[PDB]
C-alpha cells in the first residue's frame, strides 16, 4: 500500500520549496487552479455521457478551515481519480526532462504551466491527504509527508459522490492560513478567472454556511 516517489518528483519538490519559500500563498492559487481543471474535465466528459454527473450533480469548490485540527480542506466535485490515477498522477510526472533544468535556469509563473503546482502544497503542509472518488472506482485516500506515499481504500465508503479533497496538515509557519479573514482574502484573489462557484465555510453574526467568493 506504500510507495516511493520517483526521482524527478523528489527533485522538483525540492526545487519548488527552495524557489517559492517567499511566495507561499501560491499553494492556494494552485489548488484552486487544479480543482478548476478537474471540474472542467468532468464537464467535458458529461458532454458525451449523461451518467457523468450521476455521482453528484453539482460542479463546485468548497474550502474549509478547521483550526482545532490544524487542517485546510479544498474539495471539488470534478472528475476525481481512480486508485491508479492516485498512484501515477501524483507519484510520477514523465508526461519533464528539461523542466528540471529550465526551472533551475520568476518560476512562480512557470510552475502552473507544467501542471506540477500540486507539490507546492508541501510549502505549507507537513502532510497532504488526497481523498478522491472517481465514477469508475471506489473512494481512495492518498497520503504523504514527501518521504513516501500510500494509497488505501477509504474505510468510510463513498462520501464524495465524485471528486477530490486536498487536506493539508499545516506547518506552524502556516498557521496563518487557518483564519477565515486570510483564507477568504486569498481565495477571492485567486478565484476570479475560475468558471465555477468557490465557497468558504465562514462565520456570520453566529452560524456557519458556505459563503460564495466569485
Residue ranges of the annotated binding site for ATP are 34, 76, 89, 118
Strand partners, 164: 76, 132
Q: How far is the CB of 142 from ligand VC5 (least distance, A)?
A: 9
Q: How far is the CB of 41 from ligand VC5 (least distance, A)?
A: 5
Answer yes or no whether residue 144 interacts with ligand VC5 by CB under 6 A: no
CA 169/CA 35 separation, integer angstroms: 19
* Residue numbering of the annotated binding site: 34, 76, 89, 118
Half-sphere exposure (CA, 13 Å, Cβ side) for 87? 11
Range in contact with ligand VC5 (rule: CB under 6 A) among 31-39, 139-147, 185-193, 206-214: 31-39
Range in contact with ligand VC5 (rule: CB under 6 A) among 11-19, 37-45, 181-189, 202-210: 37-45
Answer yes or no whether residue 77 interacts with ligand VC5 by CB under 6 A: no
* Sole binder of ligand VC5 in the list 89, 107, 108, 214 (CB under 6 A): 89
17 Cβ partners below 8 Å, 6+ apart?
122, 123
CA dihedral over 111, 113, 116, 122, signed as positive or negative: positive
Give, as ranges, the residues between 97 and 126 that touch ligand VC5 (CB under 6 A).
115, 118
Q: How far is the CB of 102 from ligand VC5 (least distance, A)?
A: 18
Which of 3, 166, 6, 4 has its CA nearest to residue 100?
6
Give, as ranges, the residues between 150 and 189 that touch ligand VC5 (CB under 6 A).
164, 166
CA 38/CA 83 separation, integer angstroms: 16
Q: What is the 8-class DSSP label of residue 16?
A: H
Which of 1, 166, 2, 7 has its CA nearest to residue 92?
7
Helix (H, G, I), strand (E, B) or coil at 63: strand
Nearer to ligand VC5, 37 or 179 (CB): 37
Range in contact with ligand VC5 (rule: CB under 6 A) among 1-9, 28-36, 96-104, 194-202: 28-36
Buried b (16+ CB within 10 A) or exposed e, 144-167: bebeebebeebeeeeebbbbbbbb
Answer yes or no whether residue 79 interacts with ligand VC5 by CB under 6 A: yes
List of residues contacting ligand VC5 (CB under 6 A):
31, 34-35, 37-38, 41, 76, 78-81, 89-90, 115, 118, 132, 164, 166
Amino acid at each position: 500500500e506504500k510507495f516511493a516517489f520517483q526521482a524527478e518528483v523528489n527533485r522538483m519538490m525540492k526545487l519548488i520549496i527552495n524557489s517559492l519559500y517567499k511566495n507561499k500563498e501560491i499553494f492556494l492559487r494552485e489548488l484552486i487552479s487544479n480543482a478548476s481543471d478537474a471540474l472542467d474535465k468532468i464537464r467535458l466528459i458529461s458532454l458525451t455521457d449523461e451518467n457523468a454527473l450521476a455521482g453528484n450533480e453539482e460542479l463546485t469548490v468548497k474550502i474549509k478551515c478547521d483550526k482545532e485540527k490544524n487542517l485546510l480542506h479544498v474539495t471539488d466535485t470534478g472528475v476525481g481519480m481512480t486508485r491508479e490515477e492516485l498512484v501515477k498522477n501524483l507519484g510520477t510526472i514523465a508526461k519533464t526532462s528539461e523542466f528540471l533544468n529550465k526551472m533551475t535556469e520568476s518560476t512562480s509563473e512557470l510552475i502552473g504551466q507544467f501542471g506540477v503546482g500540486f507539490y507546492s502544497a508541501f510549502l505549507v503542509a507537513d502532510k497532504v491527504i488526497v481523498t478522491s472518488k472517481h465514477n469508475n472506482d471506489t473512494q481512495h485516500i492518498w497520503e504523504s509527508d514527501s518521504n513516501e506515499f500510500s494509497v488505501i481504500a477509504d474505510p468510510r465508503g463513498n462520501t464524495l459522490g465524485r471528486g477530490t479533497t486536498i487536506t493539508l496538515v499545516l506547518k506552524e509557519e502556516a498557521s496563518d492560513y487557518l483564519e477565515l479573514d486570510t483564507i477568504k482574502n486569498l481565495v477571492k484573489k485567486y478565484s476570479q478567472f475560475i468558471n465555477f462557484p468557490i465557497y468558504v465555510w465562514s462565520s456570520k453574526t453566529t452560524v456557519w454556511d458556505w459563503e460564495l467568493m466569485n
